[PDB]
Design a protein around this nucleic acid. Structure first.
Lengths: 63, 151
RNA sequence: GUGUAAGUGCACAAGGGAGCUUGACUGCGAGACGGACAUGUCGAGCAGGGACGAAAGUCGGGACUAGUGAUCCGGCACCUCU
RNA sequence: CUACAACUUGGUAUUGGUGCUCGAUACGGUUUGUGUAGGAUAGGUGGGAGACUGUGAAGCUCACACGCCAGUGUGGGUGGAGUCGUUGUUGAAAUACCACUCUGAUCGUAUUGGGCCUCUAACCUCGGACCGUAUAUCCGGUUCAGGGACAGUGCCUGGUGGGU
RNA sequence: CCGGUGCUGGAAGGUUAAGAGGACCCGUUAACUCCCUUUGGGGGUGAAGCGGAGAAUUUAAGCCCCAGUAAACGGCGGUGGUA
RNA sequence: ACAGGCGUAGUCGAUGGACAACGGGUUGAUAUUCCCGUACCCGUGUAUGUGCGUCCAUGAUGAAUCAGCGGUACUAACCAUCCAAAACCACCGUGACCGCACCUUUCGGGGUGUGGCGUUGGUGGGGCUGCAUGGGACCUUCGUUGGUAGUAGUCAAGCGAUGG
RNA sequence: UUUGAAGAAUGAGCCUGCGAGUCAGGGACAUGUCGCGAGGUUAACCCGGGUGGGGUAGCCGCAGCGAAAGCGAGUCUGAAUAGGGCGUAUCCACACAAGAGUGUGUGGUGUAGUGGUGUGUUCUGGACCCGAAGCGGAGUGAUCUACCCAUGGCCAGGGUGAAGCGCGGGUAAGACCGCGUGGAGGCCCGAACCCACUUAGGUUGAAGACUGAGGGGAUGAGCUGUGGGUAGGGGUGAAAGGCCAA
RNA sequence: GAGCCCGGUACGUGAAAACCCGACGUCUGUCUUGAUGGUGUUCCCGAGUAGCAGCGGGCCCGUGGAAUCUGCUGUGAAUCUG
RNA sequence: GUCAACCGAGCGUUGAUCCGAGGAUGUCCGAAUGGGGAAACCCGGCACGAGUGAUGUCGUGUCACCAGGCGCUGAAUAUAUAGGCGUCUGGGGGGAACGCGGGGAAGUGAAACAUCUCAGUACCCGUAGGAAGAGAAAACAAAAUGUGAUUCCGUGAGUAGUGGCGAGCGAAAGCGGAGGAUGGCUAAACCGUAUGCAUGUGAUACCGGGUAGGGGUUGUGUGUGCGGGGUUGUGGGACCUAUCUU
């Protein structure tokens, strides 16, 4: 739920900064949604994980 | 998300209209179900929309029509012209469901779509005469003889 | 008796009263006191512009010594700086 | 003291349709305007010497509204040929007519969001049934049956937080 | 004994984040409007665009608030006289 | 995120299940192992008969069909039914709201709605009929009986499971 | 090491080996010595089997004051020639004003730095040497011990006598009471087995936790073999901060 | 304690075969169905990208007036007077 | 051969022992790969041989998983997909340092400590190469008619700055050098062609002129592939249109 099967997005790593400026490690996870990909318009759906960026760009077809 | 309607959808428009709609609507309801196409290029989409609207209304079938189509499929053979080498007897290109459908419509008369013709089961990647089964309905089927003539 | 603790002072008054007024200033300051350093204290006098006084003159807060907080960071106003 | 895990709140993305229901601005309009000199509840204004009329006015019987119960606007029937102009007032003329219009209540055209009832296609099911499959309570696929644009999960955000 | 601290239940108000909203103000300059000198510089207004800070209106839980709870953590007082 | 975490099909894992040897003697050292006597358990080949079969033939006569009956049987529907699908009505209760009744705060307010509806809703009623439910049972399908050839199948030694 | 130790304060049994201010950098300051000297010098790099030759990019000195614009032997503050601050290497002569400490002018004298390198301190480095309890990263461990899972094994001997059932009494049936069979139990006494309450010995031991006498349980929440599992801020814990290879 | 005893040094010589560097050709591809210089307009010049916003990373720069580079979530443009 | 000799035996001028280069053999474990496993030891299948009267037995091959091609097949299910087959090529593991991209502490200094430092260090992960990374301006610069890809040294500089402005941290422009390739190729707009999906007023349309024939370079679209076309900042290139032309 952090690596897209199409674009290979990865979770960015960073430091959460508090009011007292205490740096604590954390990650920025991609918005990766479960999608039923229809590779061929015939209509056999396969289950994959695709980032919300790839859905918007139309890289996966839900037919 | 701008898309061109193919059929008529209530509260949205009629065929040929270009509408902008929420991307959730087009991706999950209209485009997958074939009720519209993406509005990307006027020369293509308008011509494609016209062809789609006529094709859907002209390829429809009912239970009574399926029985009538079953009898109408009793005509003679249908010939296919394909590019091939006469020395071997095997085809260069591959016969596609549109090629079979376009052959029957222009010669026989019945109007069918690619969705029903069973082609891979007959293994017609050769030269000769092969029988092709056509499923017009869940219970009703039909058989059409196919003769293939090489280039 | 001296606004206020104690001491040093003050009757020549620094104590009591009256009239005017804002020096409870600006730019400086020879020479010093005291100090590890950082602070702290006195300063005659010069210039500008004033107050009281006829004038000489006095006035850069209060009889004196306590009533206060370095630096960093930031606020406000002015400047002929970048 | 300062943080973090975990739990929790809301916004947004994945996330869609029809309905009511509002709230804002834009549009096609009406409505209302209690200084006095008065035909009198004086819009300021530009066109202003002529407009509404029988595709049916003055005058009455009623409906509804606001009401400062001073009266207006309006629907119908009735009626039938007028109300009207500098008409003299007044800084300001006509309720003769035309153009945007504001103090303010209204409806239909747009947009925007808010709340609510719904629907199925996103999404979910450790619910059933078939297939891969000889063996499989795994897994995936087709289909049926239920939820359903909620929940889950990203990003932003307020809480609780000796649990570390 | 339900005041304290928890837990459970209820929001009519008050406070309250992000996200929505962008009134007003400022930076810049098209165009002007004044000028002062003699081989171009000094004051004011300043539309549109692009920006900087941004207010009013909105908004959830929580907390403030009202009840119940002690086989919940807990509490179960002093002084004077008086046959 | 990467590293890796689980796990299906299988494949390992005795401390367990299944499986056929006992007594005597001998060397300087081994013996249920060697030797002596007598057994047991898996396979292979040869030969001898017994000994049933496949073709051949025996038994192979006899099973399937054509139809009828008689109702499984979607279909339409009926006998219709468990519940009350859904609305109906009312009583109670009161969503808001409207004057007012009450508690009222000492008296007034003010809220509530003890009121009007109505519906936060609840409770009950009967029908509307629905829900699902079969059957009786119709085509269909099949069982039985009546023929259709003791005629077409079948069928016979022996092995026989990875399956029950 | 102490105000003070022969000290009854610390250390050393003896001998022989070994064992503690070093190095890097064009670093900083100071001080010697050498080269050049209003100049000194190269770094990187190139050419030479070398230690030699080239290399002007830079650095230091050569003018200061001021926040800065800027000005310049002056400059800043300031309304000020009006004082002050910093500066004009220093010295000498002469004049002019003061004797609130000397000042201003003219003239002469003229300004010394920079490259190696020796030494002392110092900067960044472990920086004179030796020494913790503990902190983080990655791994190894349940063959000892705690708990659990699968499958086996063991518990001499002797007592007490539950329920049930039967007989008799009892009754209307009961309740219940006596006598027979039966043999239950986190039951009893007691060896194997498992523990560890008291005492004595051991205490440079036989043993880094034992021995001798007595002692508790000993058919159960029992003891034990085999194979397996749980791992460090974690496990396990009939709970003591115990156990996780003395 | 060796230039003159030995192995060697100075200086020369040595490759059948394998490998490595070159070099000359077979071979491969390309230009010649082609180039040079001139005039006035429409089309093209890398898209879920650039830009903006929220939270971070990193740059001398510790969020500061915070530019340029970059990660995740949203929003999301122009094709040269760009 | 050797510690390392002693015995017994032999080879060598017909060239031994030795040294170099290429071959053959190379048991078993190990990525270990037929299955299994407690690494180096158990059990096999298939084909071809060898061997017994036949089972037993012995050799030579071959049999793992995954990825990618290729051909057949296409479940529930209809198109078809998953999947199943057969076959060819690849991976997997090791290595001292150097590279690149990720994750990333604590002791320590701050005379405490959280911001900060230690440090993007130690360690971990994924990956190549003989080197890697970077590289041909959406760059610097500052009005000079300047530089002209990247990388690596020396300076700039412990400066500008940054910092609980604390401890500390710390550039770039420019200038001097090493190397020479200020190197190359694409995508778009246009054409031609091959297609796949559509359709067709299926005709007056598709090619430059004219003559005529025709009814498909489909009439029109579109997407994909392939050949020309173009690679530029004084903007370049496509279309258009003038002059010469090996």
């Amino acid at each position: 739920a952090a690596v897209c099967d199409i674009c290979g997005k990865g979770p960015g790593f960073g430091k959460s900064v508090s009011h007292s400026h205490r740096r604590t490690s954390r990650r920025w996870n991609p918005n990766i949604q479960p999608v039923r990909a229809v590779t061929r318009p015939g209509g056999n759906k396969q289950r994959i994980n695709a980032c919300t960026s790839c859905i918007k760009a139309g890289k996966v077809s839900r037919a | 998300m701008k898309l061109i309607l193919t059929a008529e959808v209530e509260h949205l428009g009629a065929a040929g209209d270009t509408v902008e709609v929420k991307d959730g609507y087009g991706r999950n309801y209209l485009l997958p179900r074939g009720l519209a196409i993406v509005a990307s290029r006027g020369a293509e989409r308008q011509a494609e929309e016209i062809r789609r609207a006529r094709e859907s209304k002209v390829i429809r079938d009912i239970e009574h029509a399926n029985e009538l189509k079953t009898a109408l499929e009793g005509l003679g053979d249908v010939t296919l012209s394909v590019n091939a080498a006469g020395d071997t007897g095997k085809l260069f290109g591959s016969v596609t469901a549109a090629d079979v459908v376009n052959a029957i419509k222009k010669a026989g008369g019945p109007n069918l779509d690619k969705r029903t013709v069973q082609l891979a089961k007959a293994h017609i990647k050769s030269v000769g005469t092969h029988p092709v089964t056509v499923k017009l309905h869940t219970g009703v089927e039909a058989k059409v003889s196919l003769n293939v003539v090489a280039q």
